[PDB]
Design a protein around this ligand. Sequence first.
Ligand SMILES: [Mg+2]
Ligand SMILES: [Mg+2]
Ligand SMILES: [Mg+2]
Ligand SMILES: [Mg+2]
Ligand SMILES: [Mg+2]
Ligand SMILES: [Mg+2]
Ligand SMILES: [Mg+2]
Ligand SMILES: [Mg+2]
Ligand SMILES: [Mg+2]
Ligand SMILES: [Mg+2]
Ligand SMILES: [Mg+2]
Ligand SMILES: [Mg+2]
Ligand SMILES: [Mg+2]
Ligand SMILES: [Mg+2]
Ligand SMILES: [Mg+2]
Ligand SMILES: [Mg+2]
Ligand SMILES: [Mg+2]
Ligand SMILES: [Mg+2]
Ligand SMILES: [Mg+2]
Ligand SMILES: [Mg+2]
Ligand SMILES: [Mg+2]
Ligand SMILES: [Mg+2]
Ligand SMILES: [Mg+2]
Ligand SMILES: [Mg+2]
Ligand SMILES: [Mg+2]
Ligand SMILES: [Mg+2]
Ligand SMILES: [Mg+2]
Ligand SMILES: [Mg+2]
Ligand SMILES: [Mg+2]
Ligand SMILES: [Mg+2]
Ligand SMILES: [Mg+2]
Ligand SMILES: [Mg+2]
Ligand SMILES: [Mg+2]
Ligand SMILES: [Mg+2]
Ligand SMILES: [Mg+2]
Ligand SMILES: [Mg+2]
Ligand SMILES: [Mg+2]
Ligand SMILES: [Mg+2]
Ligand SMILES: [Mg+2]
Ligand SMILES: [Mg+2]
Lengths: 150, 144, 129
Amino acid sequence: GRMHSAGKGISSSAIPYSRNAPAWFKLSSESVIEQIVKYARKGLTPSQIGVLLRDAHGVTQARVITGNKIMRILKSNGLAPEIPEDLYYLIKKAVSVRKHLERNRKDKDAKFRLILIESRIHRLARYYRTVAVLPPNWKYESATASALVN
Amino acid sequence: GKGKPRGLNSARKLRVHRRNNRWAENNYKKRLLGTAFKSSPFGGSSHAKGIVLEKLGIESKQPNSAIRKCVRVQLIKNGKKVTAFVPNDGCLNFVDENDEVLLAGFGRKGKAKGDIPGVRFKVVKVSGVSLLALWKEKKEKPRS
Amino acid sequence: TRSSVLADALNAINNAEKTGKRQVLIRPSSKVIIKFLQVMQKHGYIGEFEYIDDHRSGKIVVQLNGRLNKCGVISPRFNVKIGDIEKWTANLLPARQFGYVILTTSAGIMDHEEARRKHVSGKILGFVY
RNA sequence: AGAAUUUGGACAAACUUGGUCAUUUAGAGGAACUAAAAGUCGUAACAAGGUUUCCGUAGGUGAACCUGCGGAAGGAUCAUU
RNA sequence: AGGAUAGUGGCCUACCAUGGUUUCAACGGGUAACGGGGAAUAAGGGUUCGAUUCCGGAGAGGGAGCCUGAGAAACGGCUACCACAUCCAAGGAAGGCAGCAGGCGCGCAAAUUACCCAAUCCUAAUUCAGGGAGGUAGUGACAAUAAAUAACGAUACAGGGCCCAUUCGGGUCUUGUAAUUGGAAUGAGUACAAUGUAAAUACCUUAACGAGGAACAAUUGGAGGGCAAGUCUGGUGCCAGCAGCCGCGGUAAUUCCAGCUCCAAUAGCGUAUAUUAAAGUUGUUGCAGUUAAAAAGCUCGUAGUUGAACUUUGGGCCCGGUUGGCCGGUCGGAUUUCCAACGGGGCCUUUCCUUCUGGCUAACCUUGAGUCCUUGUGGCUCUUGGCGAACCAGGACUUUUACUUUGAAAAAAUUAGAGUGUUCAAAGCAGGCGUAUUGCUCGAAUAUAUUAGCAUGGAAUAAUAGAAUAGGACGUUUGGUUCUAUUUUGUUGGUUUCUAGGACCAUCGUAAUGAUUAAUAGGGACGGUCGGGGGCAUCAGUAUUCAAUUGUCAGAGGUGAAAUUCUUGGAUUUAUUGAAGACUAACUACUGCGAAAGCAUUUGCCAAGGACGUUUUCAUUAAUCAAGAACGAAAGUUAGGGGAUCGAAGAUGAUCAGAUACCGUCGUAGUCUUAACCAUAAACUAUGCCGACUAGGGAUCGGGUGGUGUUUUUUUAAUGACCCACUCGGCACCUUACGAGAAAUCAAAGUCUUUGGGUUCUGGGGGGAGUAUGGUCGCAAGGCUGAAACUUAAAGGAAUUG
Ligand SMILES: [Mg+2]
Ligand SMILES: [Mg+2]
Ligand SMILES: [Mg+2]
Ligand SMILES: [Mg+2]
Ligand SMILES: [Mg+2]
Ligand SMILES: [Mg+2]
Ligand SMILES: [Mg+2]
Ligand SMILES: [Mg+2]
Ligand SMILES: [Mg+2]
Ligand SMILES: [Mg+2]
Ligand SMILES: [Mg+2]
Ligand SMILES: [Mg+2]
Ligand SMILES: [Mg+2]
Ligand SMILES: [Mg+2]
Ligand SMILES: [Mg+2]
Ligand SMILES: [Mg+2]
Ligand SMILES: [Mg+2]
Ligand SMILES: [Mg+2]
Ligand SMILES: [Mg+2]
Ligand SMILES: [Mg+2]
Ligand SMILES: [Mg+2]
Ligand SMILES: [Mg+2]
Ligand SMILES: [Mg+2]
Ligand SMILES: [Mg+2]
Ligand SMILES: [Mg+2]
Ligand SMILES: [Mg+2]
Ligand SMILES: [Mg+2]
Ligand SMILES: [Mg+2]
Ligand SMILES: [Mg+2]
Ligand SMILES: [Mg+2]
Ligand SMILES: [Mg+2]
Ligand SMILES: [Mg+2]
Ligand SMILES: [Mg+2]
Ligand SMILES: [Mg+2]
Ligand SMILES: [Mg+2]
Ligand SMILES: [Mg+2]
Ligand SMILES: [Mg+2]
Ligand SMILES: [Mg+2]
Ligand SMILES: [Mg+2]
Ligand SMILES: [Mg+2]
């Protein structure tokens, strides 16, 4: 594993065997959907909405309690972002490293890490263009990449 | 997967790899370079003819100790000089000088034989007559 | 990464059989694996096997009768004509009388003798004896 | 009707010069390699080979080589809770 | 668009546009390349060859051009030029053997200046002429088939015998020896003849000749090993020579030169060169890469290759081809639901097999009239408008692809192979049987022929596509718009109305309306952490050197021993205080982090990262990667700074034969830093990366989980630290040898001849040589890429005994 490292950690979630769950959840699907929508109004990404719903509330899996997954819900309600969440966070990291590099020219493993992050950005963006989420000829051009993530 | 590709669609890779690596073989390299025609006393042929330039006594390699009785020959078709061993007890007397001689390789596809240094050809005929026939007295050299 | 789930399954069975285990676990249990195991089962080379249903790809526990010498995969799945089945059996099988080369055909996954009497051909999956 | 002759075209041999590519080849002199048995000078390596060897790099010296800097043990140490 | 052509076409022209190919290898270079059918070898896969009996193409010394013609850019046609070249009376004129024969030349290398149209065929006005096409013969050890060089007696000794050959006879049984001895047998040769043939030669046949040393005389290689066959004899004495390779030969040579004897193949046997097998030493099958040759220093990454799982399963019914299985009533051989076992098809179970025009008129859904066979569930007639779905040529008609099946196609020869007594055989395609009285008859099969294309069945495997802003499907509905259209209208043409049929669109209906998992794959987020991971700054520590003060007095340094050097002007040593630059001791370990190179004083700032936790998110986004890039010890280069220390160069003192080395004292460069270069190390775990599985154990680092577990802090709460038990990840270790290996050894170097999980790189005896050359990068040093000629029987690995 670890596309850009020699790590081999496994460390994931083990979601339950039950697809209908969990027999102590008395809340309604539409109630969870509206809580998802207002978190998306507050500018939370689907990962953050799912974390909040699991900790603060008893939402084990939004796709289980509701009918479908969180990014699908937000896209249904017009709350989809311009670029996917994971692509946004990779571009954000590349921008942060690049602004570290402009002030630290000797930081060569920062330069090495920036190459890894940008390689991860281009592979992801290539996927998203193939499944037609990003428009074709969408490109991370690395000079005005601060525009689309801030 | 022990190295080499195994995909059903990796035929190009396997054939090119084989092409690249056949250059490591002596025979394939020589044949495809055309070295026998280009860099070889006989221009790739089995036998050649020449004129005896001079008789030589070649001292054999150790641990042997002998004079091997070769001749310097200039090939008719090339002008190249070669050294040819004259095989038998005597038979250097039959060779003389300015005589035409039919030379052959010896059997080591190049690669000078035995204890004879740098000699890779042997006299088979002299003046159109077999050295074997001259050595066994079956025939005589045409004086005129 | 995992490239052939069937190669992994057949390796696990081989390494279990060679050490003397009566059972072996297999993950992740494709249906090609299931059909391959069924061809081995109908010829007595394994015993009863179980599909565990996790909600991802399942697992298999196979029971072993000690009669399997070797099960293997042929990768890549070479295209096999009717008339070059016998050269695969010659290359792979210890004897002409026993042992099976498993193929996948539009008529289904089957051994080479069922392939001979149905007069069908396809790709090679593996062998068993 | 029509020959010699004849204008202009396309086709275009061929030659001259020049350019370029290919193969082969002479060469004072220089510098290598190899073989060739018993040549001269040392003893560099193999033993801790008598300064442990070797790697990269740099300088130096008849010559093998020597020396510095980093590295390896293929070391002469698998070893000091 | 035109021209040209027989005609399409940038074929050409004018105008216009900027295209076309290419890492899936374009373009170029080489070919001791014509292509194919084929050939050699070969277990299978392969490797090499194919100028050459057939097919296609090209050419006629080299070019170009053209005439006649249906057809030629023709060459036993012409024109010109270039090259070569013949005749000449000097004026001129005539040429094209890569047709046949023949010559020269070239070379290792290849035959007669013959006879004939008799056959095969071809041309012509043509039965007739012509044909160096072709056939016949000549040369011919290319290759191939068959297969003489003797066979058989009697006399010599063997001996294997039986009545205990007693001691050998016996009518034993003669295989072997007597350069004896006997009569038989035959073609090699020679010829009457006939046959053969166009005529001949030859073969086949044949009268007469034709073997005793049946001189009618078989050779070529060998006799140490490989490798079958002598230690026989004479010669030679490291010479001559032999020897593919290992090796023989220097006075006993089984190896040379010979004789004798023997061996192998034999009308053939050696030699050279090439090629195939051997070679699993080219590797798909099927090699190797820790140490023998070979894992790129390291990571990213494109093309390539490869890539987790999931979507109709199961059951039942019917048809239904094959073995025998039972008259053995034909002296252990039909027949058959007694069936079984295989194999195909249809139907039903929620089950597409799209479609509207019209002739099928159901294995007749529904049995008016009729069950004249002594009982059965294997055999019925004009049918109650009878789903007229049992095929013809047009769609409100088409997801694409790989794969596999069958068919066909893949000239003949050739290959395999069926038949056939060419006397056999290679061959050939013949032939065979009568009543030979008036001709009868079997053949000239079959298979294979790879890829591509064509038709066809299958629907596993592997891709691909579909309904997500519904722009979705179904359609019995209802509109509208537009298009077309026969019979007709009343005949000819148009405008039309209904009706008919594409298409789109509106508005109603219908529906389970429509999004696979959540990979002990990957990415991302989040949490608390961990680390000598990195950058910038900052701080500290002694020590070294030096300086200044400072006491005291002879030595101090350095070594194995000394010299060199400092020293009564005070050296060394003591003390206080400074300055500079480097380094970061001990703690420091079979411990940590990093892609590797590397990284160890504090603190702050900055960006990053692994592992863990997770009932978070995405959902295949991945693995490995030519090309391409980032990083990359030390040394070294450039320019500043710094220059304490140690210190390639250099100096000097020693040692020694020498010492331009080791040792001693100095000492420039360098060591450090900044800004650029360089890009290499035994850059090493000499071990590519990703994935799975196969054995036991304890320790350890990081994270987590659980103990009415200790411990300090208020006495114990907690937290920390520690203990125990688990768990994920990591650096390693130990035992054993399942298994592997040549071994050393190895939990990977295992799951390998029981050989296939994916993928990248590299090697193919030792040298020459990482050399030369070209290219490219670099300021340079140099780096990357990288041969050959030649030379050689070993080099090498691991282990054993000494
Ligand atoms: Mg990785
Ligand atoms: Mg990768
Ligand atoms: Mg994993
Ligand atoms: Mg590869
Ligand atoms: Mg030394
Ligand atoms: Mg020495
Ligand atoms: Mg030494
Ligand atoms: Mg070595
Ligand atoms: Mg035109
Ligand atoms: Mg040619
Ligand atoms: Mg050919
Ligand atoms: Mg040809
Ligand atoms: Mg030729
Ligand atoms: Mg022609
Ligand atoms: Mg000529
Ligand atoms: Mg012509
Ligand atoms: Mg001619
Ligand atoms: Mg002609
Ligand atoms: Mg001729
Ligand atoms: Mg010849
Ligand atoms: Mg004729
Ligand atoms: Mg004779
Ligand atoms: Mg002899
Ligand atoms: Mg022998
Ligand atoms: Mg083989
Ligand atoms: Mg090998
Ligand atoms: Mg090696
Ligand atoms: Mg590295
Ligand atoms: Mg390495
Ligand atoms: Mg798959
Ligand atoms: Mg025959
Ligand atoms: Mg997952
Ligand atoms: Mg410290
Ligand atoms: Mg630590
Ligand atoms: Mg590269
Ligand atoms: Mg290197
Ligand atoms: Mg290496
Ligand atoms: Mg670790
Ligand atoms: Mg080799
Ligand atoms: Mg080599």
